[PDB]
Amino acid sequence: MSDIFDEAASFRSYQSKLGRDGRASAATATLTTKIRIFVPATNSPELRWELTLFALDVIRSPSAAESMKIGAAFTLISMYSERPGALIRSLLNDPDIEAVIIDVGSMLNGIPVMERRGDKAQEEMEGLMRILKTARESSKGKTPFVDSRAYGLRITDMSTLVSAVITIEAQIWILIAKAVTAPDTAEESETRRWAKYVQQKRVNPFFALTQQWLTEMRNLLSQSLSVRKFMVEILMEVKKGGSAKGRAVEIISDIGNYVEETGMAGFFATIRFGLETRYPALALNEFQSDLNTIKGLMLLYREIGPRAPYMVLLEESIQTKFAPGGYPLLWSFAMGVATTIDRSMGALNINRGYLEPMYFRLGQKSARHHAGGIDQNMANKLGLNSDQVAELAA
Amino acid sequence: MSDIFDEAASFRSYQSKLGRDGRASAATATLTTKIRIFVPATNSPELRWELTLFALDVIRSPSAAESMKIGAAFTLISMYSERPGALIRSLLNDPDIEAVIIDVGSMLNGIPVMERRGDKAQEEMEGLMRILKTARESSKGKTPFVDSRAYGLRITDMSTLVSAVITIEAQIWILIAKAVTAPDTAEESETRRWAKYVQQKRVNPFFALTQQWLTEMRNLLSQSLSVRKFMVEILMEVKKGGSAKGRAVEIISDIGNYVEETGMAGFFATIRFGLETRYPALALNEFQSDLNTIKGLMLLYREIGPRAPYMVLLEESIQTKFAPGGYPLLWSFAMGVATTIDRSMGALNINRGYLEPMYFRLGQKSARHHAGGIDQNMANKLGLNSDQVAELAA
Amino acid sequence: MSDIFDEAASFRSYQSKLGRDGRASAATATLTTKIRIFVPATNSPELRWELTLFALDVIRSPSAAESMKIGAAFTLISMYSERPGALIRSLLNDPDIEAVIIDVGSMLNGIPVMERRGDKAQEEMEGLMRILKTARESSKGKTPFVDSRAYGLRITDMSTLVSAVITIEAQIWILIAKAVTAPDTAEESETRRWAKYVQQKRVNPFFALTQQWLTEMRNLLSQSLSVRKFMVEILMEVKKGGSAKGRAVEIISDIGNYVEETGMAGFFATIRFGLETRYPALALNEFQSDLNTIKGLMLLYREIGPRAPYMVLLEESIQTKFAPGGYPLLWSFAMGVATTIDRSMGALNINRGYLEPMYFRLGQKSARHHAGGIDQNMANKLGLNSDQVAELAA
Amino acid sequence: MSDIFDEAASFRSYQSKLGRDGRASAATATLTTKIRIFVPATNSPELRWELTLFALDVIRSPSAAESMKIGAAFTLISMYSERPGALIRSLLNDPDIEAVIIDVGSMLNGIPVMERRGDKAQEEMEGLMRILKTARESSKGKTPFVDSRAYGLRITDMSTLVSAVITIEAQIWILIAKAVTAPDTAEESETRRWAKYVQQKRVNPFFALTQQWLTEMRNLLSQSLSVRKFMVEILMEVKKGGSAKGRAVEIISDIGNYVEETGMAGFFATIRFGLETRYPALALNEFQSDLNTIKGLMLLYREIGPRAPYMVLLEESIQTKFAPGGYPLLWSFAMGVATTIDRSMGALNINRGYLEPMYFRLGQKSARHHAGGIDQNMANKLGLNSDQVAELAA
RNA sequence: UUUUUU
RNA sequence: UUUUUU
RNA sequence: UUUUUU
RNA sequence: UUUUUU
RNA sequence: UUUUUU
RNA sequence: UUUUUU
């Protein structure tokens, strides 16, 4: 009767937020891994330049352990800040890892431990020398930068160090946009971002890393989750306005503008196209369940919080519920109308197992052959029937 | 049902202002660069004239470091004020740089440090002499001014110094309008502004810098963000009325009238043409999402504050969300009707990847062949059907 | 009549807080002096030990400039903190001086500048070498510590460094109690404090500086006001409870317990003895004005704020109004009863020009020969007349 | 007039809580020392017995570093708990030190590191062997226990291990009562406590450590503040009732009953004797200031919190204000009446510099020759005048 | 600063 | 201005 | 700490 | 930017 | 990202 | 799970 079909809606709403309530216990505590991070102790430009060169070499090194690579990545990311240790310690929310901040102090060819020399330090020094030697020998004499003069470059001016560091941060931060979604199909959007930032003169093109180093760093970023979590935390903190933003922070926020809502193109495309742009072909007895699921998904997305856009980057378990597969019909309709309407829509790889070609064809027809689609008109267009006819005439 | 398609609007509104709340921490502090600024200590016209000649030479100098160029630019901009040091210190909001104000004191061919002569001063003196020599030799004997007599000119009268300084400030401030949007396509609007100010007799044409110096200064301004931030802060402070405005301040505000809303022509054109000038072809099921996005953008623009018009100049990350690409359909419609209606509209370079030629054609037709477009008439024009027919007859 | 003698009280109350209202302008800005502070960049014990040895040598050095001595003192005081630069920058309220924090980085015999070596650094290195040589030659081969082995001691363990640093901070902080009140008559209370802290095992007596170095440091502390202001700010910050206190902080607070209310023994003795311990000889027509002045002084002291106890250390101008001389009669009475009652009271040098021997004799008599002094008894001692007689019998 | 002498009370009350308000900053952060703690990983009795034997040897060792001694003490104290690591981590509030909990795992003659054997482990093994050898050689073949058979004793039963561990904890916890007050004058009250616990059969006398080991451990406890802080935290946590108490916890609480209010005998004796036991000789114009100070001290003690009784153990700076010296007159009176009344009172060493023999004699007379001291009688003893006379007749 | 008993 | 004890 | 009666 | 009348 | 006029 | 544009 009347009561049923509403009890169903309440049941689905309750099932969506079924057990996602309360607070968990500390028993489910992940084992922690020690990660050694080399941060610059002082503000001298030469020390910071040598440190970032060392971090580039370590990241490029093939014999480097994963923990050393994560340490080098953390050193690189926090290089712009005047207090990298404070930035790392105050913007770390990774239960998987524990970070031991190490102030570099002075600067040799590698790093001088300067803590009980001879006792448990010489082995670390030889290890760092081996890492550097393997990094330099692995490449065919090619420096990490696309320009050989950028590697063996002496930096003593603060402005030059700042420019080079900003360029390195920009080139690193380009990769996060398509690091886990489709790392193989990258180097096109990344090149577009690099060209955009070069044309804006925000980055000096002299310090441009080669594509081999970029591929290695992207592979490291995709393999590791702690680096992604740290960078997402940095993005969230920068997104919060209120204070003055520096050049590095502004570049990071501009990149995060592209980073947001990555890996969830299906859901947002479904929203924008199938749900909005109201077409008379919506209520047809095969889209009502999908509409209810979509509404529940919007409520869940609002409930998640500030980490919702970067759900794929943090690899949230909630992301699976957002993926198409629970609403294949409306999703297929929406991507059909998207591919017919948006030219850019159509390069997306959507050869899934629930394509529903009938509904894709229905959406394709609904986009063009359906009708002009005159929605409720606040202004009284009494004589616009001929206008609608002319618009549909194309 | 009824509830859906409104939950969507609330979801998009919440997603727009998703994480832009709260206050950030001091951990994300950009590394600061020392910038040396030479300000005139006294009000003697000869000292100020020599100082601005030195600043012109330093800016024109090719061997000058970037920090020295920024110092010379800051010296030039604050030259009009009777207390340049106070103006710089009370109108600086650049976290990227720290300014060390240096009172010039006396005036030699370069600048006399007059602080422990011999100790850490002789090297600076030789450096300044090298800068001046390189600046003079780099040009083919051409002075920065278009008139050779304007360079080696003795100034002892306050009025002549004021006139020359005002001319230099005007010619510098013309460049900010098209410094980052399209610096290459400049020298047309800049020449138009210069002709306008010459015809108004606000600037004395004798102190007219050559186009080579203007190109060098524009390149420096585009490369550097601190100078842009300082000049935008000056524009914002001058825009606030209430006090008496001097000739320099009035010229600066008149230039800022053109400076405002630069680099965002797409968004404002979309507003003015597609949104306003209500055409019966608006509600057609492919513009509703764009309308919602545009409304959210207006709310965001109102929320930003007084820095909203100069978003491109400060290179805000929020500017990316305002750029066309998130609403290509309504944007294309609006630029179509603009190019058909506004003659000046059409010189804009809009060969983007989301042009949507079908909607551009639809807007072109909507501008002329659609209808006369009679909106709600407060006055009862019962007999104006023939008037509308005659108006449409063209 | 009745109205008069109350208008007088209101007049004196208004005269006390006559012009101490409103906010001052920035025109009265003291000229600032640059002070170079060498802080340890890292946490390595050897670097910190070498740095504090260098600071001890600089303080002991006779050829050192005053600014260098203040820098060495600031380096010494903030040595215990893990972030000396942050502690100095967040606890500095000295308009007289500006502090340029310098991270030491590495550690040579002196300090390596490690910033454009050769350019404006070699002269500083030779200056530091001259400072060290003069410091070592000035003494008759005597190390700053009372033990010659404590100077040329290698420190690699964190615990030993912490113990030595705590001892040095304690021995430095003993001097502030009697640095400006009576520096010449010191070395008795200072020795008592040192013995107290040795018996408590809070300080290791091996790192005990000689008395010559202590005298030099006390002279430097008395000469300089910025060091006193910084140490008073540290005392005020430590006094505020709420957080966990370390060994250094606990020692500093324990010393500040003695530091408080220094240099104002006359006023507080007058309060405690003349005002409290109510004697029938108070209201005698020569103490009413002094009572009114004392009440006004209490109101002023409450109004001053948290800096009231350390008024002599900061050399407040308000301290002059608190000194005896505006109420010599009641002050003389109070010191008379104090010298008769308190055995320790009597070592105070009070041979002032307003001693009023008649009132001193009156107080001496009031202490003993006056009466037993039975105040209002809450418990009804109906039979205690004989008890009072026996008590007065002595 | 009437207003004065109350403004004085308000002034003293405000001066007592002068600057003890607000929250301190993190700039005043003490440097932290790494402390290595060896905790038993499993519950096997043999492993725990070997671990506590090793800790006893390390504490007795003269060549052991202070950090190793603190680690051994922490291992000993938390030995009773089934999860020593959790107990240490959840009951540590020492900003001076950082604790790195180390699970022992297996058990060799010393401790097997069992973490990358050969790499940075062999040196630690040789160090532990040297520590054990020096500990065994330093003594004249004397085991830490008073019985030679208790050292080389095999423990495989859980009950025997529990009994031995409880005995060791008891003998360690006896020392805290007089570790910092008068460690030299100990071994009398400690022997009395040991005899009390032996007569109660709570501790098995077979595991009785020799007096040399007890003296060494007491010296270590007096030297170190972190161990005292940890043990005081344990005492505070145990004092909070509500849960079931084990034998070790009950013994610890019984010992803490004696531990409480240590090192503050002067203040509490002054309270109990001078303030309570109301004598007609109180209000005599030389005790009113002391009464006000005592009231302020009671308010401060109530305001301090649960850490108030163990103020001397934590070496609070607030303890100095509680010590006699700010109220020598009432203190002398109270100790006089105490020495006349309480037989145990009189062994206290009170040969201070502010004894005031006149007031001590006055208190001695007030105790006996003053009067019977009949206070307000709720029951109407109309005929008890002869009873009071007989009571005074003695 | 502290030196009792409990 | 200041010269004790704590 | 405790040493009665009940 | 401005180019009338008043 | 941006390329008009004002 | 993901593969557009921005």
Numbering used by the authors:
A (entry chain A), B (entry chain A), C (entry chain A), D (entry chain A): 1 to 394
The authors write:
The first gene encodes the nucleoprotein (N protein) which associates with the viral genomic and antigenomic RNAs to form the helical nucleocapsid. The paramyxoviral nucleocapsid assembly entirely covers the viral genome, protecting it from detection and degradation by host factors and serving as the template for viral mRNA transcription and genome replication. Following cryoEM data collection, a multimeric HeV N protein double-ring assembly was resolved to 3.5 Å resolution, enabling the building and refinement of an atomic HeV N protein model.
The HeV Ncore structure follows the common bi-lobed paramyxoviral N protein fold and includes the Nt-arm (Met1-Thr32), NTD (Thr33-Glu260), CTD (Glu261-His370), and Ct-arm (His371-Ala394), as well as bound E. coli host-derived RNA. The cryoEM map of the HeV N protein assembly fully resolved the N protein core (Ncore), however no density was observed in the map corresponding to the intrinsically disordered C-terminal N protein tail (Ntail, Ala395-Val532). The N protein surface is overall hydrophilic, with three prominent hydrophobic patches that are covered by neighbouring N protomers in the assembly. The Nt-arm alpha helix (α1) contains a strongly negatively charged, solvent-exposed region facing the central cavity consisting of residues Asp3, Asp6, and Glu7. The HeV N assembly map showed clear density for single-stranded RNA in the RNA-binding cleft that separates the NTD and CTD, which was modelled as a poly-uridine; one hexa-uridine per N protomer. The RNA molecule is positioned in the conventional ‘three-base in, three-base out’ orientation, similar to other paramyxoviruses. In the case of HeV N, the 3’-most three-base stack is oriented in towards the RNA-binding cleft while the 5’-most three-base stack are oriented towards the solvent. The cleft floor consists of the NTD-CTD-connecting loop Glu260-Ala265 continuing into α12 until Arg272 as well as the α14-containing stretch Ser317-Gly326. Within the RNA-binding cleft, a series of conserved basic (Lys178, Arg192, Arg193, Arg352) and polar (Thr181, Thr185, Gln199, Gln200, Tyr258, Gln319, Ser344, Tyr354) residues likely interact with the RNA chain through putative hydrogen bonds, salt bridges, and hydrophobic interactions.
